[PDB]
């Protein structure tokens, strides 16, 4: 007398050899695992990189006075970056947002004179704002140029800036931003540090960011009421909305953003040059590294259930532990294999529960049904 664990595959449509919602990159898509406690099950996933999807690129720019000269090179980005990425895709959409800081003390001055011109009176700075969605995602590249050229610099008091409030809003206000179900790149270009959760106590803001949308007239209305997001909050909302993040920061702060990049799963970081001269090349190099890389991630597992990952990439690279969730140097059309060993220890739930496996940046998901035998 001995019941044993089993595997069987329910949905196994082959990888595609053509809109992105119809393209298949991972197979099998659904399977059922019969688990006896202590015994592992082991299925393999095949990933084949499809040809480049369309691209929605949102440019979220630090708009402090240190960034004034940077505007004139980004002011031509709409047409330039589209012509520069024809090779990758001709279905390109671009948008623009801008941020400075929370509008309370001590992060800014609130004296009426500084509340209308935070910088020195010579400089014609506008009043400070938290986050403004200037131009929602569109292919009107020339419209991006005209609007960015018309954008007004401003400033604040302390050097670390509240870009985290803007990222959260960009990630979770999809209906206002206009994210399509395609490649979502979020470029975050600053030249200063960042505030994070817990810093808001100095401004009288202790309530944690609620991860909801609070844009009215394309401006963030509640930077006074919610703390800065935690990194965990940002990672949760960023990945849940398939936002691949590109940190274009200056060399002075690139160490902290390389550390931040390592905490965010689908993120690259490049070093911004002097006047944002090299940001077109910076993006496509960051795009080349994000698109030529696949990282799986699984949903919430009932406790008692272990999951292992082992990867087999091009040129014999074999990853284990948490690096078995990832493969790199993968070109278009390349295929790589993942081995997923999951183990249960209890008879935890009475009936079947399912979680899902997905590559980051895509809406594609592998559904894995779990059945415990007992």
């Amino acid at each position, epitope marked *: 007398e001995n019941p044993r664990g089993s595997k069987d595959i329910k949905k196994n449509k082959n990888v595609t050899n053509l809109k992105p919602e119809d393209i298949t990159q991972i197979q099998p898509q659904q399977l059922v695992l019969r688990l006896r406690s202590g015994e592992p099950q082991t299925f393999t996933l095949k990933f084949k990189r499809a040809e480049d999807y369309p691209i929605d690129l949102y440019y979220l720019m630090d708009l402090s006075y240190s960034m004034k000269d940077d505007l004139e090179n980004v002011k031509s980005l709409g047409t330039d970056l589209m012509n520069e990425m024809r090779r990758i895709t001709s279905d390109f*959409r671009i948008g623009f947002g801008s941020f400075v800081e929370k509008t309370v003390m001590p992060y800014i001055s609130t004296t009426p004179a500084k509340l209308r011109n935070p910088c020195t009176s010579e400089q014609n700075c506008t009043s400070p704002f938290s986050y403004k969605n200037v131009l929602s995602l569109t292919n*009107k590249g*020339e419209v991006f140029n005209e609007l960015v050229g018309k954008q007004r610099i401003s400033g604040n008091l302390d050097s670390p800036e509240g870009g985290f409030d803007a990222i959260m809003q960009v990630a979770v206000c999809g209906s*206002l931003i*206009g994210w399509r*179900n395609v490649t979502r790149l979020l470029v975050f270009s600053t030249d200063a540090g960042f505030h994070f959760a817990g810093d808001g106590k100095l401004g009288g803001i202790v309530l944690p960011n609620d991860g909801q949308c609070h844009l009215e007239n394309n401006m963030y209305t509640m930077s006074h009421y919610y703390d800065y997001p935690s990194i965990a909050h940002l990672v949760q909302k960023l990945s849940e909305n398939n936002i691949q993040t590109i940190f274009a920061v200056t060399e002075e702060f690139q160490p902290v953003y390389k550390e931040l990049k390592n905490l965010i799963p689908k993120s690259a970081v490049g070093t911004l040059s002097a006047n944002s001269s090299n940001v077109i090349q910076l993006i496509i190099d960051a795009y080349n590294s994000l698109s030529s890389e696949v990282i799986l991630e699984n949903g919430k597992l009932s406790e008692g259930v272990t999951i292992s990952y082992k990867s087999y990439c091009k040129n014999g690279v074999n990853g284990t532990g948490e690096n078995g969730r990832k493969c790199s140097n993968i070109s278009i059309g390349d295929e790589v294999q993942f081995e997923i060993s999951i183990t249960s220890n209890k008879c935890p739930k009475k009936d079947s529960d399912s979680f899902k496996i997905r590559p980051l940046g895509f809406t594609e998901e592998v559904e894995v049904i779990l059945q415990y035998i007992c």
Partner: antibody
Amino acid sequence: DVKLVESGGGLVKPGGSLKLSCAASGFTFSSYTMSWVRQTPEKRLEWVATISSGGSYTYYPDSVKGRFTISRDKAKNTLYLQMGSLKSEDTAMYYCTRIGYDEDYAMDHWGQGTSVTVC
Amino acid sequence: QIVVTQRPTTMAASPGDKIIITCSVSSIISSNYLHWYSQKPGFSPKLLIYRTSNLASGVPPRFSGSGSGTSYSLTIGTMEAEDVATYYCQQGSDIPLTFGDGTKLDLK
């Protein structure tokens, strides 16, 4: 306040030419993006051309590219649509519209429309 | 090209009747880029709703707009007899700018 007044429509022979004009009053002409939308006998709206506030860039649907050409005169407060190599598909009432914000491209004011018939 | 699909093509209602018209686009657009127009017969179109839910100046409170992603809707809270017209939705997100075929709302 805002008034848009189209004129220049008429009867044209296929492959011929027509030039339409919209005189803008009641608002600063150079601050806004102007465009031409036409309504066909099947009562359908077809966007025909758009030009920036400074005239530095223009957009056309591919059905009219090369035939039509949109322009504006900053000094006369009038927008033009020069039509060429015409056809029975171009038979429509042509409206002059203003775009209030380039961030949404809603046409907040429409002229009264000039009629073009093509045989 | 973004295809805008408007339904119903025609609708017949009575004063005190509550119209709900829908507008669907082939690809996701931001809610800032979907607008509604109305056209009384014998006149030109006039902006009715812009950015999905913002009433244009001079539009009565009974009109309302809603939606996101690809499905948007325009509702007339209680129809008045003057509301007889044809209603268009427009996407301004992408070049080319495309218009729905219009819902013609009439009487009985």
